[PDB]
Design a binder for this molecule. Structure first.
Ligand code: NI
Lengths: 75, 317, 75
């Protein structure tokens, strides 16, 4: 299952995942893709911020769905 | 009896709604707005058919759209936005010195200042609404922009304000991803200690108006008693804002881009804008004053930039 | 852990805090000593603005570091 991850500046990347994968996992894949620490990542979907615990299949994330990624730099 | 209307959150997606004329809009869409007017409590007229309505996001699509439009998660944004807009729509935005200003009203001098300043800066806004309103403002129609500025800053119309804070709150939504600043602190025996900053934090400074003083050195108190020297190692950005508590400062022709003066005390004060091209132009709302040089209580000074590397070298003591 | 706060008159004071204390706390601790409302209170470290959300450990404020105290302008 291919999904999109887009920044507020429009910078977008593509991730192969599954509905089973959790938020921490896609965050890990983000870290693996572009090297962004999972601790700084804030993902958003349907106008709501996502919790690290739940999975994509909870937030009704279909294929080719776009997640909004904003960064929270520590300090 | 029903009526067909449209509800939206981004002025782009118009969602069709068969409104019940018996009930009010409030009982259906929630808090509603028709061209800035809160019609949440009034019932639907036949006059209102085909017209576009602004609502708060009440489902996933509207929430998604509204977020994609405003780049904020706060669902109450539209309310403050419209509340401010109802007032900013009345302000007059004359063209002064090839720039859009605002006639003094409702303590809008700091808004006028950030507007004038922003027009002279090379910046991109990441929030569609903000960018569009910005373009419209540069064109001459800046009501929506001001309203949005007030919205994003959690400030209401009439309230006095700080230009620096507003600038921060705005640049939050600006495209400064590639903006990079690295600084270096050196003591007598504590050696060299470098620091890196990005985004808004990489184009803002509060301690000196001088940009050069940041390149030369700034005396900051350190651990081991003796004052340490802070200096700018590298500055990769389009511009730099140098701020400080309101102090008497002499502005010169080819030393900066623009600046803000704050006259008064911490109780109440008045802002004035300074922009430099041929001579020095002082913008006070709708009023303009040409000048050779300005000596006054200035708080914020803007400098243009591209990419800067240093001459400085450390000495491991 | 003591830290220094330099007011606008140059009058430097000292505060007892922990790295876990958010900026809100330290901003509130100045009130009971200098009588300044936190609402009009702004803390700057080395010319770098500090916000209520994060903490001294996040901004990397170590032992006997010196913060500068400024007030929000009312223009
Ligand atoms: Ni020595």
């Amino acid at each position: 299952m291919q999904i999109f991850v887009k920044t507020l500046t429009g910078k977008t990347i593509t991730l192969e995942v599954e509905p089973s994968d959790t938020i921490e996992n896609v965050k890990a894949k983000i870290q693996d893709k572009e090297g962004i620490p999972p601790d700084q990542q804030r993902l958003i979907f349907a106008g709501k911020q996502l919790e690290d615990g739940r999975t994509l299949s909870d937030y009704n994330i279909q294929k080719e769905s776009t997640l909004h990624l904003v960064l929270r730099l520590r300090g | 009896k029903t009526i067909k209307v449209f509800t939206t959150v981004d002025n782009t997606n118009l969602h069709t709604q068969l409104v019940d004329m018996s009930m009010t809009y409030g009982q259906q869409f929630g808090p509603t707005y028709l061209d800035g007017a809160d019609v949440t409590k009034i019932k639907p007229h036949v006059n209102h058919e085909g017209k576009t309505f602004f609502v708060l996001p009440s489902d996933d699509t509207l929430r998604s759209e509204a977020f994609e439009y405003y780049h904020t998660l706060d669902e109450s944004f539209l309310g403050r936005y419209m509340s401010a807009l109802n007032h900013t729509k009345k302000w007059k935005f004359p063209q002064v010195g090839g720039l859009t200003s605002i006639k003094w009203a409702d303590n809008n001098c700091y808004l006028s200042s950030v507007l004038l300043a922003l027009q002279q800066l090379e910046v991109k806004f990441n929030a569609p609404a903000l960018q569009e309103a910005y373009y419209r403002a540069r064109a001459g129609d800046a009501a929506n922009f001001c309203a949005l500025i007030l919205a994003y800053s959690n400030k209401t119309v009439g309230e006095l304000g700080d230009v620096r804070e507003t600038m921060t709150h705005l640049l939050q939504h600006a495209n400064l991803e590639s903006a990079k600043r690295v600084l270096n602190v050196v003591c007598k025996h504590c050696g060299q200690k470098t620091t890196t900053l990005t985004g808004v934090e990489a184009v803002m400074y509060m301690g000196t108006l001088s940009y050069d003083n940041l390149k030369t050195g700034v005396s900051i108190p350190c651990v081991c008693g003796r004052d340490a020297t802070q200096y700018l190692v590298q500055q990769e950005s389009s511009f730099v804002m140098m701020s400080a508590p309101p102090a008497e400062y002499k502005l010169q022709q080819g030393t900066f881009l623009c600046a803000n003066e704050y006259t008064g005390n911490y109780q109440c004060g008045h802002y004035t804008h300074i922009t430099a091209k041929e001579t020095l132009y002082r913008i006070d709302g709708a009023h303009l004053t040409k000048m050779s040089e300005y000596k006054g209580p200035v708080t914020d000074v803007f400098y243009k930039e591209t990419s800067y590397t240093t001459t400085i070298k450390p000495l491991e003591h």
